[PDB]
């Protein structure tokens, strides 16, 4: 439900050093999916950090409508139950909650526990797998009602089968009408993108549609 | 012009029966809209639409994003009473203690030795249905929003508590805030600015209490 615009944007993490992002340009229309691809260290997370205001541009301009939900590359779990971790200070709606769980491939895992979503997380209670942790982190982010969704490599510690189900039913079906920026380097994901931004060493190597990328 | 609905229709399942058929209303800033109707009329579904959980197939909905929703069905998270009420929001004693008073919780809370620091489980099985409903309503009214969607909050409350809460919370505490109340009580309808009566997804009545009285 937002517009994301970047015009000739450049930024530095360290004063007088090498720019982390060099001359970035893009316009994401309401409800569109932007795929951000690139090599390791390209500046993908740094671009999302800029949208969040954690990185100030030295040159250029950024425009957006706030109400942003961010999903980190690195899963984080707070002490408390599974439900406590997903809802996270957001009012509880059963339909929204149970729909998000289904979409994020969590129902089967949660139902395996006798206490279900009331199982206590962290060291005190239980230790989940990397995939379970990643799914709970994504669930929390998609449960938050925002205008823009910044999903930084959420499928990183997930198996290809789960990732396929989550991408199709969550990113594409559940969040279909919400503006989304997905940090991914998978063609499988790129085919479903509205626009694609390819970064390499802070620079924009490609910006356009999937058909434009296909014609290269 | 806080909440506006124009020729709005929506479906829960594609090709099925529309849950809401050609809905029209305009709720001005700080007004109280009463949403009445039979069971299954589409009242909750109308609130779900305002929340963005239901997308309209046809029509347009206009409002400011700041919404606080009170469910028909009480939910209590693991933690203290204070933890449940203040939730994500920051703590202000005046606001906290005023909301407790308005929501008829002070006497119940003071009955405990630990007061608001009493630990609740999930679902608040320790508390009564009324205590659970009051904590849920308190949490909703403690959230500072522009619009308050109160879906049948008085459902599991006694008529005496409900009267106190409606008068001192819905009417006095939230007097200047736009609020939608799902209620089929005449006692509540008399105090409404506008009334929407739904029946099988359709709007059977829309207008003032005097207009409803003249029927």
């Amino acid at each position, epitope marked *: 439900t937002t517009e994301v615009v970047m015009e000739n944007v450049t930024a530095f993490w360290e004063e007088g050093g090498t720019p982390v992002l060099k001359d970035i340009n893009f316009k994401i229309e309401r409800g569109q999916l932007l795929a951000v691809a690139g090599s390791t260290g390209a500046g993908k997370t740094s671009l999302l950090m800029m949208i969040m205001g954690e990185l100030e541009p030295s040159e250029g301009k950024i425009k957006h409508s706030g109400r942003i939900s961010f999903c980190s590359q690195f899963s984080w779990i707070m002490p408390g139950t599974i439900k406590e971790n997903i809802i996270f200070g957001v009012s509880y709606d059963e339909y929204r909650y149970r729909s998000v769980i289904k979409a994020c491939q969590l129902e089967e895992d949660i139902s395996k526990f006798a*206490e279900k979503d009331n199982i206590v997380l962290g060291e005190g209670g239980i230790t989940l797998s990397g995939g379970q942790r990643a799914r709970i982190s994504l669930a929390r982010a998609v449960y938050k009602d925002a205008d823009l969704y910044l999903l930084d490599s959420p499928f990183g510690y997930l198996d290809v089968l789960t990732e396929k189900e989550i991408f199709e039913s969550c990113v594409c079906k559940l969040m279909a009408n919400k503006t989304r920026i997905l940090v991914t380097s998978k063609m499988e994901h790129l085919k479903k993108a509205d626009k694609i931004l390819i970064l390499h060493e802070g620079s924009s190597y490609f910006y356009g549609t999937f058909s434009e990328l296909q014609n290269l | 012009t806080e909440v506006v609905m124009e020729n709005v229709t929506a479906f829960w399942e594609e090709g099925g029966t529309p849950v809401l058929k050609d809905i029209n209303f305009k709720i001005e800033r700080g007004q109280l809209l009463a949403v009445a109707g039979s069971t299954g009329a589409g009242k909750t579904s109308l609130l779900m639409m305002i929340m963005g959980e239901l997308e309209p197939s046809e029509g347009k909905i206009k409002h400011s994003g700041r919404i606080s929703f009170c469910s028909q069905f009480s939910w209590i998270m693991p933690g203290t009473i204070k933890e449940n009420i203040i939730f994500g929001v920051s703590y202000d004693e005046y606001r906290y203690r005023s909301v407790i008073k308005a929501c008829q919780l002070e006497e119940d809370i003071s009955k405990f030795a630990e007061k608001d620091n009493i630990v609740l489980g999930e679902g608040g099985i320790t508390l009564s*249905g009324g205590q659970r409903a009051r904590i849920s309503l308190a949490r909703a009214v403690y959230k500072d929003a522009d619009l308050y969607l109160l879906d049948s909050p008085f459902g599991y409350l006694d008529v005496l508590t409900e009267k106190e809460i409606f008068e001192s919370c819905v009417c006095k505490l939230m007097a200047n805030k736009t609020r939608i109340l799902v209620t089929s009580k005449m006692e509540h309808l008399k105090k409404a600015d506008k009334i929407l009566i739904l029946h099988e997804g359709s709007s059977y009545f829309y207008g003032t209490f005097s207009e409803l009285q003249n029927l």
Partner: nanobody
Amino acid sequence: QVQLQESGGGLVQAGGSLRLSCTASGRAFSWYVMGWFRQAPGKEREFVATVSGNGSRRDYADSVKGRFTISRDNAKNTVYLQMNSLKPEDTAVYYCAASSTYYYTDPEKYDYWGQGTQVTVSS
């Protein structure tokens, strides 16, 4: 897991009324979607009514719509079925079942079942 036990069945005069109860023993009763199912002599188990864990969602079979009402009490771990204006067609063994998956009315999605109660209607 949850252990279910139904009660309230018996013989009733047509246009009558009967109320069935089902108490569940186990953890996280609110996670389960509860449902009432009927098995007519010779026929398969047909869905009658369902309740979401919250109680927010209630769905009924077209045949029972407007006459039957499904309710829940999570504090008492009980689910009820109020059967008003009964017809001889409603004669069947009424089962109470729990589903650990969100929102389905097909009995195939329900893992935990009760013993059942016979409910007979004579014109």
